[model samples]
Target chain A: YFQSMLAAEAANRDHVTRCVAQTGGSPDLVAHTAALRLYLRVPHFLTEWTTDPDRRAAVSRALALDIVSMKLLDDLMDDDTGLDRVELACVCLRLHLRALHELESLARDPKAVTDILEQDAVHLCGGQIRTKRSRATNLREWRAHASTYGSTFLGRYGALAAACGGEGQPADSVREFAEAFAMTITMADDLTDYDRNGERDGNLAHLMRTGAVAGQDVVDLLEELRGRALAAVAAPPGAPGLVPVVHLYTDDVLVRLLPRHL
Target chain B: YFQSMLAAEAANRDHVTRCVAQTGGSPDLVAHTAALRLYLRVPHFLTEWTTDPDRRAAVSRALALDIVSMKLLDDLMDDDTGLDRVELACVCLRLHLRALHELESLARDPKAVTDILEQDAVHLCGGQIRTKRSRATNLREWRAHASTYGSTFLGRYGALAAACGGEGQPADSVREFAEAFAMTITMADDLTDYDRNGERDGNLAHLMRTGAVAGQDVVDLLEELRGRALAAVAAPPGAPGLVPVVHLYTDDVLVRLLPRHL
Candidate 1:
């Protein structure tokens, strides 16, 4: 399924590939273009097991577009400002829009899916606009904020899963695991970013406010969060192949965040 | 038709209005929230005359959503970081995404529409990112840039027109007129910004780079562009009442840039 999805993605990428070649992007940049699409494989993997071809296609396209669009916006927010910045963002926006449209054709309740997405959009924006101080007043408040912040990703994954077939409390559990996974990812990201940039980060600030130093212990906290995330995902419902599917999803995040040699 | 479209827009606005209220935004802010949706009246007007109800509805919804979403983004870009900045942007992005999705249902060639929109999106981004130096390297370049910049709006209007049955050279003219209208607006905007900020402007710079401080002459150039925009719209194909339909559309821009007192 992933292979077939990639084949479809390749067809979509032809225009972009031609655009890059026409503009004389460096070979490395062209490679970077393809690499970006690879990140969307998770969505492809998730939808692969579904029986309906149309649903599969729509979900794949929507997830791919949504992930790519968000990446472009995030890049813009971070001030990457490459020559292709505006053009790339535009392309991503159009694709994302089309993806949403495609979802309208497949989802059980299109409006419900749209509403969930709208909420996710708001949550995602809030995640971006925060400052360390604004994030939390104290450690307790920070934890609460972290849970809420983490839910953005959790909610999206859960909604996508529910849209596919998962439902009821098991679906709820999937969301909770996603929440835990997102929190672990966030903690790891904050630690890494603080370490690299030497900036006073929200998580660090909260820890300091609660009387913890901002160095080695942060690494320990991240490890603890990862364990909790995995523990939560240990038992998803007995939907056929659900556990492995989710495990693969969770592992993708864990692998990315795990510390490694350069 | 316009009245029915207004009814639909009103329904849409209720959600936005409610969101603004729920956020505890000030009364003035809530009022401002509703004000933004008024610009969408133009698109609603354009699609009102279509006989097919589904097509009309889809186009109207798409146009309305697209217009409103752009307004939200433009506000975000202009440092209008109001109380609900992140939240508002999120809502706007969702609507924008949905708008593009709606376009897929109405357009003759959805991909083609997306491609043109991609170009427009890039143009819109460039409009936001310009510095004075980048605007005018030479008179020829400046004029060329002006037309290109305006075409972003023009392309959208033209594409929307084509999507709803207009095609070929006539549609090309619709786009050309839109380009002309956009340039006039841009020039008017440049003058207004220059006057208010007491800063160097691209149009002013272009003129100075070319010749004298002909303030009146620049206004004359603006008038000429306006005339071209109106002339281009003198004949549109036989869609029921497209002339007056477009007249109102063109007038919205004209009235805004006509230099009136409150």
Candidate 2:
């Protein structure tokens, strides 16, 4: 009966339950299951960074809280949010502080995690700000914007590295995977969100449309990036399950999200 | 001749020179002289946290960058920003990363500073967001809004504590000074900004008007807060110049910014 839930399913169930407990059942938040699940996949790669099972469990839980706590801010900035903005914001603050406190106990260097998180935050917020006020003229510029807006994963990866691996910079191979995964998602968002409104200072689809490309170019570009992401996963050792995790993430992304939409 | 520049004048001058060099003479940023001076005063209170001159200088510089970096975001979010949004943001990001990197070399713990910044950020952003959509309707609610929107000072004061002290939580006396200072500024802003347009989800004056008070009440409330802030400054030992800094800041807000307007 305990085995009734698949490992993947269990990861999300616990996240949902704990997120509920953390935010006191803010229904506005739990609805972001897909968003929460993406973060759930983060700790899967950094498992090799620390050998302590207790530390892994603790670190993973803290990162989970960190992701959800930030999700509220991300959404709120978009003019959308949950619970009450004040109540919601206060809870997010407390939840985020909770995350840092827990992570501090497990991390080797406390400032490194903060450093990486702030680095990504500035980029993320700046990236979002950029899209609102200006438009990137080509793929090169769009990619640059993607690097900032899509930097959340690096923070997660780096924070985990600090927790178990002694500092916030992920291993080279892992970083390549993170960046590739990051670019692919922005591309995926480009294609999907286009159906609603073709947009952005620069998004993959828009860049392609304005350039010397059209139908199926997005498909080719995303798959090309997806393969590149998978390629980087081949090099890790002692990082068991990381390969499977990447493959699953890329597979679900390309097969489930883009295939139907594209 | 060397001492012709007042000590306060010297602080802003160096901040201007370094900030100009840091961003290659971005004039828009340097114009925030008053803003930068407020942050310069931050290190004054955390003096006892570390005795090393190198650490003090390094920590102070990092914090100066941190304030300017976040100031860009605050202004940008308000739809009033300097430089190109992207160039400005990128510079801000780089400056902030520089700040954290330098501070990490000195701070006893890193995540604590990040923790305080993020905590304040969520509150500050949420508080701003609330004002756009809802009205708080009373003094208690108005004060609550003040805490969130005006939390930047706390982030600075707390970050300084983390940099100098072992971690982020400022001493009780310092925290008291920070919060009182925070609330007083909001009251001052309420009165000053009223001349342009009476506003907000909750502001000190707005709350006062809605309740049973009028005119001189905002003056009383703000000065009351100013005194409380100064009162806390008196309790710290080895944090010399801190009392003078608080006194000077409060005096400016009340005497210069508010007196004639009131």
Candidate 3:
């Protein structure tokens, strides 16, 4: 019935619009045109996973994490490190964000992520949890000791590691697959869009966070990607498959994309 | 003695360099200055935690994980998601990566992390272990059908969680502040210096076996100092008194010394 309403004929060129209005129907000529255009061209978006629910779920879970990671990266910007860290965070965030947005636009709801560890925070003083106090205190003390690095301090990573390890990871494979996928995709996207994103976004590296990608001598990350891919293709079977993915994206995406735009 | 040298150096030509380099001797400078610097700084580093060997042990253990976590963040640029499970892997990966990077840089270590569920990861994975099957039939058929996000995947965080609780976290406030401190400091430094230290130094995240303060960030991470101070000031008195000869620096150092050049 909806399809019939959409297909209803009109009296004139603009009649289609009027007919739809009279029939309480809606028209999506622009959408239809876009679909047609994409269908005919070297399609920029495709749904290979849709054909298989399992693949789609895995990909979805990965994408969901990617989006959330972007949010986490954004939060890191508020951290006291310099813009370099912020910039790096942004790159990661953007990479994941773009992937997430792209997947969402492509009409996919990834499986909810499940493998992350959850802390059962122990109580601290009155009505509080000891976990928060215990963890945060160590970070503060490390900062207080240093005059040079200042509040940025040393224990941040420990907190992050705890968060990562929250609930123990399952021995299963699909969940791990999702994690590896999000990580690789984020790297690739960061590499591909580093420059345009950098300028348009901000030199987050300079202001928000610290650190830069390696090898100023190298021009293209793709070269690195190729090497990494070769290494991965040759890796012993049953080894963590995601390690190669990390290498490939770093070589191809981050190194290549940043230079291109910058 | 040092004051006299400073006076003599102030008005003279090439005096500052000469005094420290020649008259005082580099070795003398190394011993005394290093001692002074460490003495002035170490207590502050240990501020939130007490001199008790047990707390120190906890912190050390946490730091060890942080060392690995930071390295992992650097490597993650290559592959955010795992190899298999086309669906939810990326989402899970994003949350995990976020936790890893933040824990390394801010929280200091895996053990330092306080809240796992609050991490963006939990939301990303939707707190559920799911499953999916691959289209490819060549590999073990059973392996293909795996949990979507929960413990189905595997990594370091998982190991730590199991050690703490059956999951990645404690049933209560079991995570020591020392552990959190270690993870944050090490990982953040490594991440901030990923390019300089990662590939060139061959110090990939997972490959790092021990924790040490050698990176540019370790020497210059002003923000870290501030975090330590905050942690220290916030800590309870009933908590064991932190060791002496620490807590020398103040938060001002972060603003005064750490470069805005990030």
Candidate maximizing DockQ? 2
Clash statistics: count for each candidate: 0, 3, 168
Candidate 1 lDDT over residue span A138-161, tens digit each: 444555566654556545755665
Report the Cα lDDT for candidate 1.
Answer: 0.52
Q: What lDDT would each prediction earn against the true structure?
A: 0.52, 0.55, 0.28
Question: Of the candidates numbered 2 and 3, which has the greater TM-score value?
Answer: 2
What TM-score does chain A of each model score against the native chain A? 0.63, 0.74, 0.26
Cα lDDT tens digits, model 1, B111-148, are 45455555445444444334222656444455566665
Residue-wise lDDT of candidate 2 within B1-262, one digit each (tens)? 1132145335634753464344433455555533455555544444334446555555555666666655554543443433444444444545555665565656564555555554545445545555544656665566666676564555455446544554333366666676777776566677667556655445555555455334465566667776776676666343444556556656776677655443
Instruction: Tell me which residue pairs clash in candidate 1.
Output: none
Tell me how each candidate scores on DockQ against the true complex: 0.14, 0.17, 0.01
| Residues forming the 10-long window of minimal summed lDDT in candidate 1 chain A | A253-262
Q: Report the C-alpha lDDT of model 3 over A172-236, residue by residue, as the tens digit.
A: 22223322333333334434444434521222222112233233322333353344334432343
**Candidate 2 residue runs with Cα over 4 Å from true position:** A1-36, A43-54, A68-98, A115-159, A162-170, A207-211, A214-227, A236-262, B1-54, B68-99, B109-159, B162-170, B208-211, B214-227, B236-262
Candidate 1 vs 3: which has more DockQ: 1
Deviation of model 2 at A66, angstroms: 3.9
Q: Is candidate 1 or candidate 3 better by lDDT?
A: 1
Considering every candidate listed, which one attains the maximal lDDT? 2
Fnat for every candidate: 0.03, 0.11, 0.00
Q: Output the lDDT of residue A140, model 1.
A: 48
lDDT of 2 by residue, A1-262 (tens): 1131144335644754464444443455455543455566555454434456556556666666666655554543443333444444444444565666566656676665655655555446545555555656665566666666664545345445544444433466566666777676666677667655655445555555555334365566567776766676566443444556556655665676655443
